[PDB]
């Protein structure tokens, strides 16, 4: 129940502190509904690596340029397992005006922890990006069902 994460690199779209905050808040969403304890590391071997990259980036799932696929993430495992990759050809944002990193990271971390996609459009795990005010964002009951089915 104790999972480490590291931010490999920072999108130039955002301030470094804003990337840190968005990612920290995204892990907090999942920690708030599970026994999971997440610890950020700055250097070293983490369970979950966060990476921004474009096109082909070393995993056999190349990105596709601006638009299309925004991000993907691997389920829990050794190596690339757990990692969450964000397509740098998107414009990552703290709020709107691009693709919101926090919301996207909530979705990807879901996959990092072993979740698939939901058929509930209110779930963060439903694979349609839609901006919502970050302060009013809430996991759906379907997301909570999924994650609690794995942890606890
Ligand atoms: C509410 O906040 C949200 C909800 C959903 C996502 C989300 C939605 C879609 C995608 S995507 O990369 O375009 C995509 C679209 C369809 C099928 C697969 C994918 C890849 C994917 O599911 N990555 O996790 C990636 C992230 C992002 C943020
Ligand atoms: Ca893309
Ligand atoms: Ca990993
Ligand atoms: Ca970018
Ligand atoms: Zn990748
Ligand atoms: Zn997804």
From Swiss-Prot:
This is Macrophage metalloelastase. Zn(2+) 1 binds at residues 57, 59, 72, 85. Found in alveolar macrophages but not in peripheral blood monocytes. It is found in: Secreted, Extracellular space, Extracellular matrix. The conserved cysteine present in the cysteine-switch motif binds the catalytic zinc ion, thus inhibiting the enzyme. The dissociation of the cysteine from the zinc ion upon the activation-peptide release activates the enzyme. The active site is at residue 108. Zn(2+) 2 binds at residues 107, 111, 117. Ca(2+) 1 binds at residues 13, 88, 90. It comes from the Eukaryota. Transmembrane segments: none annotated. Belongs to the peptidase M10A family. The chain holds residues 112 to 263 of 470 of the full protein.
């Amino acid at each position: 129940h104790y999972i480490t994460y590291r931010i490999n690199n920072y999108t130039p779209d955002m301030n470094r502190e804003d990337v840190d905050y968005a990612i920290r808040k995204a892990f907090q969403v999942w920690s708030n509904v599970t026994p999971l304890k997440f610890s950020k590391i700055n250097t070293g071997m983490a369970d979950i690596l966060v990476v921004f990259a474009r096109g082909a980036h070393g995993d056999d799932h190349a990105f596709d340029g601006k638009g299309g696929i925004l991000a993907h993430a691997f389920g829990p495992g050794s190596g690339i397992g757990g990692d969450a990759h964000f397509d740098e050809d998107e414009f990552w944002t703290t709020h709107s005006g691009g693709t919101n990193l926090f919301l996207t990271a909530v979705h990807e971390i879901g996959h990092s922890l072993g979740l698939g996609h939901s058929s509930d459009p209110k779930a963060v795990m439903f694979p349609t990006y839609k901006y919502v005010d970050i302060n009013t964002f809430r996991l759906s009951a379907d997301d909570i069902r999924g994650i609690q089915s794995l942890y606890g």
